[PDB]
Amino acid sequence: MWQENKSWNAHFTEHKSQGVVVLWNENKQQGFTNNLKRANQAFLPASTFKIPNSLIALDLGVVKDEHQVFKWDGQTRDIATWNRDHNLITAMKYSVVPVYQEFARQIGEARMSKMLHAFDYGNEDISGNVDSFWLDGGIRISATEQISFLRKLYHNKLHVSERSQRIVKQAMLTEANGDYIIRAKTGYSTRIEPKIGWWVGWVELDDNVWFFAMNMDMPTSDGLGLRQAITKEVLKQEKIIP
Amino acid sequence: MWQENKSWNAHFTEHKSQGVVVLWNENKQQGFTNNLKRANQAFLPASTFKIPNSLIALDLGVVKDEHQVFKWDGQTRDIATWNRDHNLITAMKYSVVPVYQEFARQIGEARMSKMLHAFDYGNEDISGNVDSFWLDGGIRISATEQISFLRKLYHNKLHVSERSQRIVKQAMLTEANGDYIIRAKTGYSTRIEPKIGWWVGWVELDDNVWFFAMNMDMPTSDGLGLRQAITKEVLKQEKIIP
Ligand SMILES: O=S(=O)(O)c1ccc2c(c1)Cc1cc(S(=O)(=O)O)ccc1-2
Ligand SMILES: O=S(=O)(O)c1ccc2c(c1)Cc1cc(S(=O)(=O)O)ccc1-2
Ligand SMILES: [Cl-]
Ligand SMILES: [Cl-]
Ligand SMILES: [Cl-]
Ligand code: NA
Numbered sequence A, B: 001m002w003q004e005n006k007s008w009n010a011h012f013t014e015h016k017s018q019g020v021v022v023l024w025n026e027n028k029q030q031g032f033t034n035n036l037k038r039a040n041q042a043f044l045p046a047s048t049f050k051i052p053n054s055l056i057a058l059d060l061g062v063v064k065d066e067h068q069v070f071k072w073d074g075q076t077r078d079i080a081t082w083n084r085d086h087n088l089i090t091a092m093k094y095s096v097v098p099v100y101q102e103f104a105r106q107i108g109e110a111r112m113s114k115m116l117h118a119f120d121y122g123n124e125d126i127s128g129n130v131d132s133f134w135l136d137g138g139i140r141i142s143a144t145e146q147i148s149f150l151r152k153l154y155h156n157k158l159h160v161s162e163r164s165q166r167i168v169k170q171a172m173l174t175e176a177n178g179d180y181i182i183r184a185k186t187g188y189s190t191r192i193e194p195k196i197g198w199w200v201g202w203v204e205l206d207d208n209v210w211f212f213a214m215n216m217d218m219p220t221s222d223g224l225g226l227r228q229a230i231t232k233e234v235l236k237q238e239k240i241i242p
Helices: A006-014 A046-059 A088-093 A097-107 A109-119 A143-154 A162-171 A226-237 B006-013 B046-060 B088-093 B097-119 B143-154 B162-171 B226-237
Strands: A002-004 A019-025 A030-033 A173-176 A181-189 A196-205 A208-217 B002-004 B019-025 B030-033 B173-176 B181-189 B196-204 B209-217
Touching: A006 A019, A006 A226, A019 A143, A019 A226, A030 A143, A046 A088, A046 A097, A046 A109, A046 A143, A046 A162, A046 A181, A046 A196, A088 A162, A097 A109, A143 A162, A143 A196, A143 A208, A162 A173, A162 B162, A196 A226, A208 A226, B006 B226, B019 B143, B019 B226, B030 B143, B046 B088, B046 B097, B046 B143, B046 B162, B046 B181, B046 B196, B088 B162, B143 B162, B143 B196, B143 B209, B162 B173, B196 B226, B209 B226
Parallel strands: A002 A030, B002 B030
Antiparallel strands: A019 A030, A019 A208, A173 A181, A173 B173, A181 A196, A196 A208, B019 B030, B019 B209, B173 B181, B181 B196, B196 B209
16 A cells, blocks of 8 residues: 655765655555655644645635735845735745734633644644644654645545545645646755755545645755655656657 | 626637626625626626525535545546545536535525525526426526626625525635635526526725626637636736735
């Protein structure tokens, strides 16, 4: 049910980087990865936590819907896309950290904790600040655990309303053409070593869906584009996308 | 306001064709079109009717969700992609008429009539066969009446459940980008003259959404690609998309 395929290491070697790509064929119920040990290694989720965060905030009424505007607080920060107004969809696309830090503060630690235990999310530990634990706190999740989380989301089986799950899957939209749809979330763990980049989500085809979760060492922000590029190369190699 | 911009007719005559593009700017509550009379002329919706027909089917339980499979009945039809199993997503993408004819027969004339009345859809007239009235019966809808119908859909304001409207808006997904999202439905009125091609939906930007409804004369299926091509050129002229 899980098969190791180190063909894909060649895609990490070229860009002088290392990491893990994990695919899951949903129809056949079979998993593939270049490195099953790192596949089960738990790191900080970083901005991939915006997926469970969105669900909790929506199911609790902190966020009314995907159209609610969240005004910029006036403190100009070092990423240009952060210094403007945002809704749920744009706050996710640009990983607007302070928007989600406000969601977290209003969710509170007690309710945040019960929801992560309900979601089966990683080690389910929110040690640290409630508004930064996914960046520098105790939470840990492996790539396989990301897949398990994403499958429950895809099947509307997480312990939230169907409406919350449909909104977040709508917000996860990244790319779509006549061949496929990609719903995913990027992540850049920047505050605690090892600095790693994430990309987790799934590829919707006509007659299948392929879940993926990847992470890789990211010692510099100049390598962030590799997260999508390397994962697409693996998808191309396994004829999943043209 | 409404404003007529005949500049766009260049795009129609460069391909020896004739049609109307209707644009609605949601944030500014202002509309635009190259031909105001044709914008309010009502044609057969053809397969753009798959939008209301999906909503009704989902809301009534004829279709339980978007994963439910409608298996091929074995009759080999002229369009290759019709001769296979489908779900709601792929049936909509490939305008699989026989799957939607089955929905119409299970909905029946009475409930279908009542729903279009509540939807305020076009002339609300299902005269003709219960499973082909949108292709050769008495139903008619204008391009602006399409905008008005899509606007309620986008805002979850139709009489059907929020769940129905969110599922259909998912199935409408056509193209998604770092710059925009397009939810739309294609149509081709082939049975009653004049043969026309449709494209209706909207373009989601970061802070705005542009609704559009277009139709054009279509004597032959060879020119169906001009629907999207001409609409995108208009979107490029108005600097909505890059
Ligand atoms: O590539 S993305 O995953 O979209 C991405 C790109 C940049 C940053 C983040 C995510 C999260 C983050 C946190 C911080 S901070 O903790 O220093 O405040 C600084 C930059 C970024
Ligand atoms: O470009 S699309 O809007 O996706 C499109 C393209 C072809 C056809 C349809 C839609 C609806 C349709 C009906 C018929 S029939 O009435 O003769 O059975 C034949 C062909 C087509
Ligand atoms: Cl889904
Ligand atoms: Cl979507
Ligand atoms: Cl459902
Ligand atoms: Na059609």
